[PDB]
Write a protein that binds this DNA or RNA. Structure first.
Lengths: 49, 149, 147, 248, 49, 98, 308, 235
RNA sequence: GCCGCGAU
């Protein structure tokens, strides 16, 4: 899990250590991190919220 | 232009058909644009019919016998208004148009015979050093989309 | 217009055809066996193909002849297809030869070589027979790569 | 999985799947038909003396393996004689140059060798075989778009492919069109031909947006306007991805 | 083998091969200029090839 | 090693592929295990035993007074399909082969 | 030291094609001004285009109306190309009603107060029987650039009834523009440049107004460069502790340990507040009882603490 | 909504030495960063008023190929050194300067005869290392105010070869812009994700701060549009 | 879970 898959294109503005990630493809792979950082900063208290 | 393609893909896969089809498409669209310009100013049927007739018979011993002497006037107008976008020429598989015929068709439409025109950079506005081949290629949208993958 | 056709291709292709006809007459004379004439035809066709390749490459390399402050000189060409071939970006001498010069002897039905080669490049067209002949090599290469 | 030199006029040498099934699946040529028993046959034009005639004989592999067959791309005089005294020919699974009188059969057309999939590629003779194969196998995966657009350059084969595919509505015995709608076409037949008694008119119910097998759309729009004469075999509505009866 | 695996190729090579080439006659012959700054300035201004 | 390295390199150099010799020699070293013992004295005789185990045994015996107990061995050369299956542990070589 | 370019010799070839001349220009400024003005004119020119269309008998864009020759999809595609000029309004409604035989053109649309149809010969649909009628309402807006129908969601802030067919908007009148530079006819000066701009639009915008708008936009953008210079949130928290309905022995203890907000009480792990004097085992559970009643489990971890 | 565009805010300036500057502007509307960058670069490079030395006279032989009288640096090197010299002259279109040095030691830009109307910004700019040993060097230079960059195409002045030998056709760089470069990067604001951010790298020969050069280019380009922005003015 | 089609 924590894995995604998609088509690749070319980015000529990128640096040698960077890759472009669709923000729709993120927010799924990093969901538990979002939960933790939301509960940390107090935007939502309970996990359901 | 509408699509930009890499030249480095032609000389290694040997699709010279790409370049020839591009030149032929440019010639056909040139003829179509000439017809559209003639139709915009609502010229008389005589010169439009003469231009269509002179465009159709061009070739080297071609087995095409389209003649507008027997063609109705309103039918000629409909034909012109139908192919105002571009004269839809056709080349059979293994006996097609040679380079001579393509260049003759290009010369009919007031276009460079070589098929390459000069282009300007969209952002800087400086002329590109070398001529670039601008033409019309028939593109297909394949069924391997993103949202399904 | 980048694929410049060597002008001397037709002269030496006709010379090769004349030599082939002469060796066919020699075979008809009965003093030559099938293997010897077949091998000699293969050798002469290879020589003619190499000569065409050399002619095309020489005509394409220093093709540009640009004047100087005095009289005229010659340099390496700025031809786009030759620029791609030489710089190492894409292409090679063999592919460039296939585009402009003779396609060359080719056959892979069972590993043997057909006596008659493909004498037409891709800037011009191919007959039905030449396309059918090249299809053998194409299909064999595809299957080998797959397996 | 290899191209046998008997695949000439019967099975396409270009079109085939790529990876696993390379050469195990084929597509019939454009003129190839089946014998009574089930062997592939191809048509040729008979040659008598040095003049080629218009009679057409269907030949199988065994029968064509003995005669001498000419080439389609051979110059032909006005009356029917061969222009050149030496003619390229195939004798027995090979090729050579034969005399003007030694030939027996002539190829019928230049499209005979290839199938219908690879017959719509303009300038096919300028492509490598692998790239032609890729293009042929990739033309089948195009999707129908919003507005069909005729190809500015083609091989004339669009008409047969579009009409014969059964995706267009062709007037079976039409006369003059009477009522044109976005979903119905009512044509009144010509006075020349009828079925006696009860008269009759032809009614075509076009199929609107309908799910296809690959979850695409199937649509039909009329191309005739009103009062337009319609001959037998004319095209009235163009299905998905077809412009005025031409594949697009 | 120790050879560098990340290497310019395709258009990049054509970018440099076209840049590092000489012609027997062009805009500006035998000109003398201070350094690379003046070379770039002359090329951008359209005064040299 | 020189025999194997030179011939296998001819295949790669002919087509224009550069591969360092150290990678070929690593495979050969794995190919030269499982020595056969030609003598006795240390509970081994006419059997295939790992060279590493034989080397530590003779060194132990030679370190002690009984230096004659150390028994001369005969090295073997097996195939990579057979050498990989003659691994001492049974979890490996039971996830690759029959 | 630099001559100021002036707008002179403006002529029109047709209702759309137009040529604009700027006669006085220096050596390098011709190309610079030409390219900048071309980019400005192509990128962002205000215009008006059809926003949405409601047809009386249809339900969705993929339907067919009896009596018309074209599907609703093709009608929407035809309307997308409509060219209309408005004055003083930005949400103007156009109604079109027609019954009969033949094409229905843009000239049939009812004459609004201040709405000019640049071309009235723009056929949009065909009526193919005597007893069929078409009645439709077009809401047309004013915009700047290309805005897809899909990407707009604020129009769904108010729920749209079924029957509203959303169409894409273009808003850009300048279809094509090219420029050219020539040697000026001025002979007193050594050499001067003259710039000629040809623009093919849809007729909605006058050429001179377009040139003026582009110049104003460029000047406003340059105004930045003319002077460089420059050289715990949820309502549940931040709530005072004296509302949890706590006991008396808790209130004095709660104030004794500087717990004035609900949040800082949550951040106290169980094992440590038991060291508080006279906390009470039964009392501590009561704090845990009433605090968990709000859903704030003990032992949460916050980042920063404001003083309010 | 219409006729309201994003103006860049919080420009950032990173200064290197006293002649190198990197200016970052964000956010700009899509298709505007490129326009502004190209217009500013073209103006800064092609037409920017400034002054540079253009005529040189050296005692001795006047040919293009010269023995250099044993001055251990070819006259071509002397002309190249004189090309890059930066001066400030106020209120004079053309000015003649003279330098004369004898004795062992490299010569500097401060060796020129002192005059109040021309200032030197790089006094230690080396011109030569003296005529080898035990000799003297005398140079008469002529500097005029010009625009942009003008090469030594031809003299087209005086008569016959009088002007070419009187000036030696020293290539002159009038515009005080050594190098100008611009890049456009992606930036986002609120819900919008397609905005252009401009990075301008500017290095000047001196006599003018890079920000001052940017301001001058912006001012002249804005005043070029006064005839169109006058009547169509917000204020 | 078994075929059949297909992309690299």
């Amino acid at each position: 899990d924590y894995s995604g898959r998609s088509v690749i294109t070319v980015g000529p503005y990128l640096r040698l250590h960077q890759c472009g990630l669709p923000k729709k493809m993120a927010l799924e792979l990093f969901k538990p991190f979002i939960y933790g950082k939301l509960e940390l900063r107090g935007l939502a208290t309970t996990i359901k919220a | 232009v509408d699509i930009v393609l890499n030249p480095l893909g032609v000389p290694s896969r040997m699709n010279i058909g790409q370049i020839l089809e591009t030149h032929l498409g440019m010639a056909a669209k040139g003829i179509g644009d000439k017809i559209n310009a003639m139709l915009k100013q609502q010229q008389e049927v005589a010169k439009l019919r003469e231009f269509i007739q002179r465009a159709y018979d061009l070739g080297a011993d071609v087995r095409q016998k389209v003649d507008l002497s027997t063609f109705s006037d309103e039918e000629v107008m409909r034909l012109a208004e139908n192919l105002r976008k571009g004269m839809p020429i056709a080349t059979p598989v293994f006996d097609g148009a040679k380079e001579a015929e393509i260049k003759e068709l290009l010369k009919l439409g007031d276009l460079p015979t070589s098929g390459q025109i000069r282009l300007y950079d969209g952002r800087t506005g400086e002329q590109f050093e070398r001529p670039v081949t601008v033409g019309y290629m028939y593109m297909l949208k394949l069924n391997h989309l993103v949202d399904d993958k | 217009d980048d694929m410049v056709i060597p002008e001397k291709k037709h002269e030496i292709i006709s010379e090769a055809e004349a030599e082939v006809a002469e060796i066919q007459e020699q075979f008809q004379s009965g003093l030559v066996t099938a293997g010897e004439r077949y091998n000699k035809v293969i050798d002469i066709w290879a020589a003619a193909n190499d000569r065409v390749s050399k002619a095309m490459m020489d005509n394409l390399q220093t093709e540009t002849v640009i004047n100087r402050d005095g009289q005229e000189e010659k340099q390496v060409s700025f031809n786009s297809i030759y620029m791609m071939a030489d710089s190492g970006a894409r292409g090679s001498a063999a592919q460039i030869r296939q585009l402009a010069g003779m396609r060359g002897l080719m056959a892979k039905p069972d590993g043997s070589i057909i006596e008659t080669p493909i004498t037409a490049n891709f800037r011009e067209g191919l007959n039905v027979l030449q396309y059918f002949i090249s299809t053998h090599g194409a299909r064999k290469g595809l299957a080998d790569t797959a397996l | 999985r290899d191209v046998h030199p008997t695949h000439y006029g019967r099975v396409c040498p270009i079109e085939t799947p790529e990876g696993p099934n390379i050469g195990l699946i084929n597509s019939l040529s454009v003129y190839a038909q089946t014998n009574e028993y089930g062997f592939l046959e191809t048509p040729y034009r008979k040659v008598t003396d040095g003049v080629v005639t218009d009679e057409i004989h269907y030949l199988s592999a065994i029968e064509e393996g003995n005669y001498v067959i000419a080439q389609a791309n051979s110059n032909l005089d006005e009356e029917g004689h061969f222009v050149e005294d030496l003619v390229t020919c195939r004798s027995k699974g090979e090729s050579s140059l034969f005399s003007r009188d030694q030939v027996d059969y002539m190829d019928v057309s230049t499209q005979q060798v290839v199938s219908v999939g690879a017959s719509l590629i303009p300038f096919l003779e300028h492509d490598d075989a692998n790239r032609a194969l890729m293009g042929a196998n990739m033309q089948r995966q195009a999707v129908p778009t919003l507005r069909a657009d005729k190809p500015l350059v083609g091989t004339g084969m669009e008409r047969a492919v579009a009409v014969d595919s059964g995706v267009t509505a062709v007037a079976k015995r039409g006369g003059v069109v009477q009522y044109v709608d976005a979903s119905r076409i009512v044509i009144k037949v010509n006075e020349d031909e009828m079925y006696p008694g009860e008269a009759g008119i032809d009614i075509y119910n076009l199929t609107k947006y309908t799910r296809s097998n690959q979850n695409t759309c199937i649509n039909q729009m009329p191309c005739v306007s009103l009062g337009e004469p319609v001959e037998r075999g004319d095209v009235l509505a163009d299905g998905p991805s077809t412009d005025l009866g031409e594949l697009a | 083998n120790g050879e560098p695996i990340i290497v310019p190729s395709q258009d990049v090579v054509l970018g440099l091969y076209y840049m590092t080439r000489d012609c027997v006659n062009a805009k500006g012959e035998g000109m003398v200029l201070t350094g690379p700054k003046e070379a770039e300035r002359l090329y951008r201004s359209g005064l040299a090839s | 090693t020189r025999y194997i390295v030179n011939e296998v390199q001819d295949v790669y150099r002919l087509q224009g592929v550069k591969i360092n010799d150290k990678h070929i020699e690593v495979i050969v070293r794995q190919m030269l295990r499982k020595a056969t013992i030609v003598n006795a004295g240390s509970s081994d005789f006419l059997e295939g035993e790992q060279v590493e185990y034989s080397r530590v045994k003779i060194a132990n015996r030679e370190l002690e007074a009984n230096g004659k107990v150390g028994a001369t061995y005969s090295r073997d050369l097996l195939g990579i399909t057979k050498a990989s299956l003659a691994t001492e542990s049974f979890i490996s070589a039971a996830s690759f082969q029959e | 030291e630099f001559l100021k370019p002036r707008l002179v010799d403006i002529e029109q070839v047709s209702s759309t094609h137009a040529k604009v001349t700027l006669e006085p220009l220096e050596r390098g400024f011709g190309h610079t001004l030409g390219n900048a003005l071309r980019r400005i004119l192509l990128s962002s020119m205000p215009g008006c285009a059809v926003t949405e269309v409601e047809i009386d008998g249809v339900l969705h864009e993929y339907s067919t109306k009896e009596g018309v020759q074209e599907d609703i999809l093709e009608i929407l595609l035809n309307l997308k190309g409509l060219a209309v000029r408005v004055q003083g309004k930005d949400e103007v409604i156009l109604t079109l009603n027609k019954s009969g035989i033949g094409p229905v053109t843009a000239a049939d649309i009812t004459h609004d107060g201040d709405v000019e149809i640049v071309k009235p010969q723009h056929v949009i649909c065909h009526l193919t029987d005597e007893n069929a009628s078409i009645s439709m309402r077009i809401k047309v807006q004013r915009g700047r650039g290309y805005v897809p129908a899909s990407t707009r969601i604020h129009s769904e802030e108010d729920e749209r009834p079924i029957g509203r067919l959303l169409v894409d908007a273009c808003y850009s009148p300048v279809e094509r523009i090219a420029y050219n530079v020539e040697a000026a006819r001025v002979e007193q000066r050594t050499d001067l440049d003259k710039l000629v701009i040809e623009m093919e639009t849809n007729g909605t915008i006058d050429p001179e107004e377009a040139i003026r708008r582009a110049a104003t936009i460029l000047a406003e953008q340059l105004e930045a460069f003319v002077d460089l210079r420059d050289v715990e949130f949820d309502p549940i928290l931040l709530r005072p502790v004296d509302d949890l309905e706590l006991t008396v022995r808790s209130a004095n203890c709660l104030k004794a340990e500087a717990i004035h907000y609900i949040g800082d009480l949550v951040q106290r792990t169980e094992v440590e507040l038991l060291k508080t004097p006279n906390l009470g085992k039964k009392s501590l559970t009561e704090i845990k009882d009433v605090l968990a009643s709000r859903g704030l489990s003990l032992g949460m971890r916050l980042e920063n603490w404001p003083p309010a």
